[PDB]
Ligand binder design. Sequence first.
Ligand SMILES: [Mg+2]
Ligand SMILES: [Mg+2]
Ligand SMILES: [Mg+2]
Ligand SMILES: [Mg+2]
Ligand SMILES: [Mg+2]
Ligand SMILES: [Mg+2]
Lengths: 208, 99, 99, 83
Amino acid sequence: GRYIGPVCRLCRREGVKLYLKGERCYSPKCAMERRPYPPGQHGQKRARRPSDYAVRLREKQKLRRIYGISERQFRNLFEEASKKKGVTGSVFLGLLESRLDNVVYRLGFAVSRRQARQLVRHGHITVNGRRVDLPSYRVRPGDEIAVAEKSRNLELIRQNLEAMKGRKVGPWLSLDVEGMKGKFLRLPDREDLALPVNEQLVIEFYSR
Amino acid sequence: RNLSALKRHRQSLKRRLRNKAKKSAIKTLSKKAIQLAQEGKAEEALKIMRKAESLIDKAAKGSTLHKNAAARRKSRLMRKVRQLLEAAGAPLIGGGLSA
Amino acid sequence: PKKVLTGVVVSDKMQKTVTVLVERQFPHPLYGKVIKRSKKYLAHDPEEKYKLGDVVEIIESRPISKRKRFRVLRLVESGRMDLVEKYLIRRQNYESLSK
Amino acid sequence: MVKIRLARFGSKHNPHYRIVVTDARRKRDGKYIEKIGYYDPRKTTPDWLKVDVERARYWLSVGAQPTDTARRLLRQAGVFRQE
RNA sequence: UGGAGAGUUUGAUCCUGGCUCAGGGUGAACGCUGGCGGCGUGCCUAAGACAUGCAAGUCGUGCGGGCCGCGGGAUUUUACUCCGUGGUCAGCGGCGGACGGGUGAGUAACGCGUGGGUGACCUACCCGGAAGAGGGGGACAACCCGGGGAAACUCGGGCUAAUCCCCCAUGUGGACCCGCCCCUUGGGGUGUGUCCAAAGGGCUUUGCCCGCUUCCGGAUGGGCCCGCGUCCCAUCAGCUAGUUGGUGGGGUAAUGGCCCACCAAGGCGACGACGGGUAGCCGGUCUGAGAGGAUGGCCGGCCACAGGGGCACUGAGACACGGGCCCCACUCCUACGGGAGGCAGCAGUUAGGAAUCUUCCGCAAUGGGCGCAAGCCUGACGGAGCGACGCCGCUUGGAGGAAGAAGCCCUUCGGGGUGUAAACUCCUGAACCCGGGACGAAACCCCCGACGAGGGGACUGACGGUACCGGGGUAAUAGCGCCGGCCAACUCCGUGCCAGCAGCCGCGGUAAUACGGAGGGCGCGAGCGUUACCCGGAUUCACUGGGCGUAAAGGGCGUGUAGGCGGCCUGGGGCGUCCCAUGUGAAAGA
Ligand SMILES: [Mg+2]
Ligand SMILES: [Mg+2]
Ligand SMILES: [Mg+2]
Ligand SMILES: [Mg+2]
Ligand SMILES: [Mg+2]
Ligand SMILES: [Mg+2]
């Protein structure tokens, strides 16, 4: 599954900073500072006036590329969201936002989603104490998301969790910094997220 | 290649034979009775009917003629006999008929 | 409940039997319009009683022949030779349809 | 001779039986006359045995034989326990 | 909670209109590629042919033997004989072999679906209730002695047991005829008359267990019948002699031309008979905004078939896949007379084919057959194995890291690109190694109690040293398609109407974003493409929802048959239509 290749490289093309590295994509480039244009031989020749289609494509590309979840998986989540009760555009967001790998990152245990995903695969995370190694794991509200006491030692867990000492966190989350753990309070309201992304267009890409 | 329940066959044959046999009596005896009534025979034609009746009932004790194929035969027979006797004169002596 | 059908007698040309035309009508599954449709039944009339042009009720019955499976329950009204007329002409149209 | 017996639902390495009255001659997982309970041998849930005992008593009343292991479950839910 | 359209007829336009693409699906196959797991799934073709093993038995608590043992007795003389017991082999006798499992050939039909009927019926084992088992008699295998055959086998003679067969009794009762009563298709009740029961076995032995007989009910399972529904062709229009009905038989568990005799002359069809083609039907499945279209593989239900064609026997049940008989076609044995056989059971072989699995492991679980039980049988089944065939989860790293190596590609020779990508620093640690290690299994049974209720006890795991838990631990796989427009993605060479591309429109004739290569780019990712097929879009068969002056389409015109349609008022009825209740609509699926 999952991407694996040049990255603060779509921080590019998709036209806008995705923090996919995070740690660096904050400081003289998401690559996106030095060259704010599409990749490849042609990427700074005069923009082609893009089609109604193109537009819708890129936009979903953008959104998906942010959580680095794969097309297959992304699509399933969307269809899930459609058939579900309530405003489908939003719910979808709620749902992507419930993936453990994302929440691990939203809580700050890692500095990126790709790094966050690894901490999940490698047993470093718990949910309500019991261990969980699925990035795709669906976090529901009331769930407690711990660092694994056995993992609490490593230079990484240290550095990132220390970094959090000053830091503020998601209205829909809570985070006790000392005891290396978070709570997932509620699923995020569209407003709570600041995503560089117009979801109504994504819905539109899954019409025709 | 040797299924020992072809024993079932062996018995089936024995049973086939025992049945065949009982039934043959029943037929040949009924014939006899209705033939005798066709000739107006108080004593002798019932005397025989009465045997045939019995022989049928017995047949229905086990597998031969079970049921009310029994009952059918009895009915058909004691109709046939009864009618044939009033179709000539003479009514009386003995027998399995309610007068 | 044994089905009860009501129709018109269009044949007494058989002993102890009548042919009864039962019309039925309903909405057509796809096209909506209420359409008519009918069926002849051969019904049991043991006292050769009902005649050409009677409207009768017909009742679901223990079989009498291959195709006799209804008995004539009662009579609704006599006379209706228009209905028989309708059937008969429709029947004769048929010659004027081959080669 | 009709039967109270087990009927295999669930999946592979995931048995869940249904406790059913059915004709003796019918296939294991086939058409039954009534469901009257269930049973999860691996006890994965608090809810691992359940039996409609009024119903179990009816079918017994009309003479259905439980399997040996069906009756085991039946007894455990107190079908036979009297006074 | 639901509905997107685009390309292509012209110099241009509007319109008709077809073709084509974008989406979804599949038991797939094919190409390039291919790491791990769970759960599904896998002969769509020849219902062709099949080597081999296995797929249905079991009961010694129904019965008597044969063969191999062992042990006791009678006689004190050793031969002969009685009893007990262990193997083992069939036989008689039971219950099962009609289930389970396989296939879709045939079937356009009461086959299926759905709703009803049976006063026209059956149901072994199970449950409940009423009442019984008292006398006699007989035979056939086994075993023994003969004969025929190469073999399959087979003919005769003699002995014998029983829960095997018969006879008499008893008749709770039931059956039948006739009558009468109620009820109404053959449903109950009643009276003469007649007829009909049984089997024994075990013992923890006078009192229990397993059985037997008659009958009334229950339960489950089935037969038969009926209304409605169920594909294409009218370039198939007439069809029919058991034909349609009757009366009387026969036959069945039971109705019925189901069959037969006799009589009558009828039955069916444009609302599509008859004929031809195709086809198992459904629950469902896929698609669609829906109406609809398409479909019926896995799973569940029904049906039908067991090399092809007949047919009956036995039985509660079969006209019986692993029973029987005959005809036919094939294969095998044959001493040429005769015989054996039937994977559309699990594996497997071979043939056909674009294509479809292991001659595996286990009865541990569930379920089934016999058994009082212990148990035995169970290729049903529970698992494992092969295949990216499908779905789902996971990996091929994470954070740093230059105004930015080399190489390669572009270049107005300044430079621009691949690119934070690599290198390189730290970090984590798929795989792999070590240690522990399941649930699935508590019953049958035994003990206590009372063989009940209830309590106590023991045996048992194919999967499997697997899942899962703990410890250790290596930076560790990327491919395929596409970049003229529709359609997301552009440049240099090569090539010169060639070689080639191509879903449609169309590219190529020396400057090709369309061919081939390369840099770069878009898309998806253990996959990606291709081909085939289904629905979509297609309001392009238009019910929802189309049309016919010139686009395809008004019949050359009438007459009027069936049929369709029918002004205004009032009344009955209540068929259509509408409403309330109620039954039905299994499970799976949704
Ligand atoms: Mg053109
Ligand atoms: Mg033109
Ligand atoms: Mg042009
Ligand atoms: Mg067009
Ligand atoms: Mg048109
Ligand atoms: Mg024209």
